[PDB]
């Protein structure tokens, strides 16, 4: 572990970028130099960092048998060491697991821990919108995202740093206090 990939990821591959047909270690490395973003589902091929065989997308290399990743799902065409992850259709990406921690709520349309189950207030889709604070994606995001007691959900980052300035909803200004406030799965 830690010889081969990039800062997001332990990969023995690069993606094949559909889009710009550029290689990029992952679609963070690609989505942080690219006018557009990389759609992960699309990515049809690789290339094996230790000997460059441009393949099509699996666990270990046609040509040499590097393992490419120890986790590796073909639905995102993603690769790391095992960080436990699982891969939910509902979700429709890779989760942090373990699976069994966790269970995907239809209503706000994300994994969430087993004991927000029945026990939290739902918010429509409310995983698939922009965080209150920093306005960008909550259901993708590799931070864990926190439900509060309102069913509003912050990232765990912006949730912190917004305890250093007050204690409220920062939509609905409902107090932080209370039940059904949890944690949600991390995007792998
Ligand atoms: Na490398
Ligand atoms: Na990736
Ligand atoms: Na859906
Ligand atoms: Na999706
Ligand atoms: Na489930
Ligand atoms: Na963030
Ligand atoms: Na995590
Ligand atoms: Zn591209
Ligand atoms: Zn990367
Ligand atoms: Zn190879
Ligand atoms: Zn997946
Ligand atoms: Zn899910
Ligand atoms: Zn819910
Ligand atoms: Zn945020
Ligand atoms: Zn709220």
């Known amino acids: 572990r830690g010889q081969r990939g990039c ?85 429709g990406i890779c989760r942090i697991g373990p699976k069994e921690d966790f269970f995907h709520c239809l209503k706000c349309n994300l994994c969430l821990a087993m004991n927000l189950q029945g026990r939290h207030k739902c918010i429509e889709n409310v995983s698939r919108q922009n965080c209150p604070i920093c306005l960008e994606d909550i259901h993708t995001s590799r931070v864990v ?17 917004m305890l250093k300035e007050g204690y409220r909803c920062p939509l609905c200004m409902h107090s932080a206090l209370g039940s059904g406030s949890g944690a949600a799965a991390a995007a792998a």
Not at 28 to 36: A, G, P, Q, T, V
């Open 7 to 91: 800062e997001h990821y332990d990969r023995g591959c690069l993606l094949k970028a559909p889009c710009c047909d550029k290689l990029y270690t992952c679609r963070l490395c690609h989505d942080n130099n690219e006018d557009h973003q990389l759609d992960r589902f699309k990515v049809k091929e690789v290339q094996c960092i230790n000997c460059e065989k441009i393949q099509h997308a699996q666990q270990t290399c046609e040509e040499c048998s590097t393992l490419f990743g120890e986790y590796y799902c073909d639905i995102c065409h993603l690769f790391d060491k095992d960080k436990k992850q699982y891969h939910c259709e509902n979700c």
């Open 145 to 161: 995202a926190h439900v509060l007691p309102c069913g509003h959900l912050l990232h765990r980052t912006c949730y912190e740093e």
